[model samples]
Target: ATNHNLHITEKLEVLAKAYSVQGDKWRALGYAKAINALKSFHKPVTSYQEACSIPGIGKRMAEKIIEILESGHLRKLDHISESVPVLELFSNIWGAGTKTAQMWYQQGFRSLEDIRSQASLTTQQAIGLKHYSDFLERMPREEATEIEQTVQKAAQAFNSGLLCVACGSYRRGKATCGDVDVLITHPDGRSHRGIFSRLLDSLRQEGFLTDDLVSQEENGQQQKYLGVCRLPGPGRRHRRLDIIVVPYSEFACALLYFTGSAHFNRSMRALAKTKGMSLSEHALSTAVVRNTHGCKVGPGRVLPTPTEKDVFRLLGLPYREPAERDW
Candidate 1:
């Protein structure tokens, strides 16, 4: 899907990924097949009817191909040219923000190599670019487990009672996961304090945690570590991993946010708003006052959520298991 006829396949690839994200897997597969077919295509496809003769392209696929050939932008892509896929591809590079991503797009940097060669590089962006393909692809659930377990064992060495749980897609029953997020805390409420520091130290000393994307990202009472890791083996690829340590008081609330589908959480927050409450990763609060522009005029009162079920109970929503939370 590179230079051979990128003008065609590039647009289709973006459409395919967008469909995949939209959960239109069948449509995405059709686009994916045509992209593979077009990648090996010898010449520039000039017309609607000409693209019809190309292998693996159907009437609908060619309709899109014609749209690309006729106009530089695929119609839907032009609408969301501004959407995911390409823009996301650039922003996904570890350090590049969406602002930087838009800048690259305007500079005509579409593919990874374009930025790799010409764009001014930040140290983090360069490392992100180096592992572009690796980070873009998701790992198997089994790989996430291995990474999760590694963090647990590492934390256990510092204290046997440390609680380490994987959040995000792994927690939500996705067969594949983008990254391993291990939320760490202590049952005793205080053991987690010095443990994350020591655990990160030992992991680095053991050469487990490779590059630091952001180190010790501090928030109120919680701190986080974002870095790259590769399991010890003959052949393995770099993986993005996050380790978060929050005090036990906020454990359940953190779990609820971290284990979210992101979509469902918005509804949860919406309900919270209706009830004069606010829900965030840190704590759930009540009588949250907001005025013009819906900006909070009050910090409100923090309510403790001891377990994930408590968050549900407080929200007046049924407690769904992690497996069903994907909805």
Candidate 2:
């Protein structure tokens, strides 16, 4: 399935993800598993029998594949895609999910203005609507770089040894990034504490950070802030910014997680599961034990991941450059 039947597979994959976003968990899992099997299939699935023969694909899924093979499209996908505008509009609101979106739609809310005037909006949703258009536009690479520099400079001003690197699409070498993801850590391993709020205060004082969408502590050693920021000039667009402060020990895993293209991350996580390991933004571990319900039974043994190469080595995957990780 390298590229064989990719057009058909892509359509099904989108439908699968749309179902996931719509809260159809069982259907989403079925579609996701089938999509994975299709990706590993050796050739185009030309007939219902051929598709049904694939593991994880049932007769119903085979019928859909046959539909694609014959008509070059799936009617179900068309219906889902057509309804996406409304789903996307509500889902874009910070803290709102598909259920909330559907609820608003059912209540007769159709637009941002409708939500603002008729719906009971959360504080975060109100702010999300206020900068709706700004959040919709991706930031140019040049602007993302400048935003990184702005934060980097402010970080160093507070602690010279602090390290600041932008991750996400910016690190993936994309021409545009949906937002700036900056990871901050101290080389000495102990100086990262208290830097999160201080750095945000400094940026706000400099008129760089405009508004806060979320600010929270995680795992006792990490601080994350999601907010809007604008460059120091007239006519500058407000862009989303995510700042993460982590202990040095977690920097490697943090970087890997934040630099992801999402699909790559999912593949890596699936690989970890196969190896009896668990990999996350905070750390990579071995001998991970999960209950029947898929919950961790205990904290696993944390493997040493001092660098990205270390994590890759542990997973037996050759180190892939960020730019090459778009898949």
Candidate 3:
């Protein structure tokens, strides 16, 4: 699915993803398969029969292809794209999914104001709606750095040994980032256990953290927080902030996972699978056994991943700097 015919396949890809966003899984899968087939074919499909003849493409899918070939567009896609207004309204809510959007559309809600007035939104969604515009805009890298420094100062007050580094796009050297992701850990390995609550309290007291989206523990050792924060000044924008605290033992894996272009992460995971190993945000394991259905037969033995370089070395890959990992 990596050949030419980009002109036709590109539009088809959009329609396929739109169907996915609309929660029409069956239709989405069909279109997705057809897109892959078209991409694999050596040349542009010229007719309905030609499209149908391709493997994995059927009559209905062929019709869509023919429509695009003849008129350079699909009427169905046009209609679906028009539903963006309502769909966008629903998807903007923090935890809302495609199903939630469909439900709200069926319930006759037309706008954010409508949902604000009538819909019973969760506490997180309420805060998301309150700062809708602020959340939509990406923050400048300078602002993200300032946010990190603010948190770092507050965290040091609790435990001077705590290590804090901004991950995500900021660490990837992006000029702007959708949000800030800060990873905190202690070199002593045990001191990170109780720092989450106290650090959050200190931040809240300084009027830095404005709202909380999620605050929970993963595997009982990693603490995570999702919230909104703002710098102390005029003309400042509220930005989404994520904080994660983990023991030094998991720091390398956690940092690698958090400082990712999701595409890069998926490729790394696939590479691990090809070598009879498994990699996760938590840790790397060896001797993983997967059945014919791709289910794990038993838990694999954990491998020593004391550093990020060790992970890349185990996978037989060159160490890529954070700025070079945008793929």
Candidate 4:
């Protein structure tokens, strides 16, 4: 599926539409699977029957595919997704997710302009407001590397054995990233437990971090820090940065979560859900509830993962180099 002659076929379009209206997650997954199957076929689907023969497809969907093939449009999808502007606005917010976006839309906020005027924005949202446009620009790879070094040095200065890595789109091998995601932990399990505040203080003292967003400490075992800062240069732009400090035992899981395309993470979580297991930055757990087909029902427990390779091994995914993790 990764290396194939993938093209957006009409069959794919129809299935995407059905899932959109029904909100059938598994059906959507099925469409995605068929699309991947078609991509592996390396040629266009010749007819509706040809598409129906693929796994996870049926007659109703086949007719829809035929419609798209003939008209180059799925009218239902267009109508259902017409409010995409609102969906997109919610997606763009710093701390907001899709569910939040849907809620906002139902509550009558229709656009980014509307959200800006109506919603009670968080501190992170405020920073998001100030540099909304700039945050969308990708930093040059060189600038990303420079920022990585800055965080790495400050982290090491605070704790000698601390490991600091910049993840997200950078780790996914993107030439530019919307923001920097810095993951910090230590080889020794307990050192990172309480070092977040101290590290933040050190970085702030050097004027590396200019504004605080969510300085939520005392949140039990894990600590998260989000903020904005600009590199000390005359024309440098203010950038969004997220720092997450976790226990050493959770380092591998955290690394995978932070080093994601969000979509990739969703795929992994769905896979875990199918196996009666749950995956998260904290750990992977097993013996979760699955429906009749072994799909997960609840969040599972944390498995011991001391290294990143261990995480891939647990999920049965071949270990991919960071540079190749894009998508």
Score candidate 1 by TM-score against the native: 0.73
User: Where in model 1 is the C-alpha error above 4 Å?
Assistant: 1-92, 97-99, 108-111, 289-299
CA lDDT of every candidate: 0.81, 0.80, 0.80, 0.70
Error of 2 at 63 (Å): 23
Per-residue lDDT for 171 in model 4?
A: 84
lDDT per residue for candidate 3 within 55-79, as digits (tens), equals 9986546755665566443223234
Count of residue pairs whose backbone atoms collide, per candidate = 1, 0, 0, 2
RMSD each, Å: 9.9, 9.6, 9.5, 10.4
* Cα lDDT tens digits for candidate 1, 1-327: 445777777668877888698566986899899988888877877766567788898755675566446545323334454544676568778788767776787777877889999999887798788787688678999999999999998888878888999996899888888788899998879888878777887899887888887777889999899889988987788898988999999999998898876656877888898887889899998966779798878768999788889888988888899888764
| Clash count in backbone of candidate 2 | 0
Which residue window of length 10 is worst by lDDT in model 2?
71-80
- Candidate 1 local distance difference test against the native: 0.81
Q: Name the 10 consecutive residues with the lowest summed lDDT in model 1.
A: 73-82
- TM-score of model number 4: 0.63
lDDT of 4 by residue, 47-137 (tens): 7557767766654456545544554332233333444444544655777655566667667786677778887676667667667666755
Q: lDDT per residue, candidate 2, 1-327, as tens digits?
A: 166768666767776777677666777788778888888877977766578778888755676566545644223332445444565568778667666776786677767889999898876788778888787578889999988988998889998878999996899998888789999998889899888877788888878888887866475577888888989878898898888989999999999998986767888999998988888998998865779998979767889999999999999899999999865
List the lowest-lDDT window of 10 residues for candidate 4. 71-80
Error (Å) of candidate 3 at residue 52 is 26
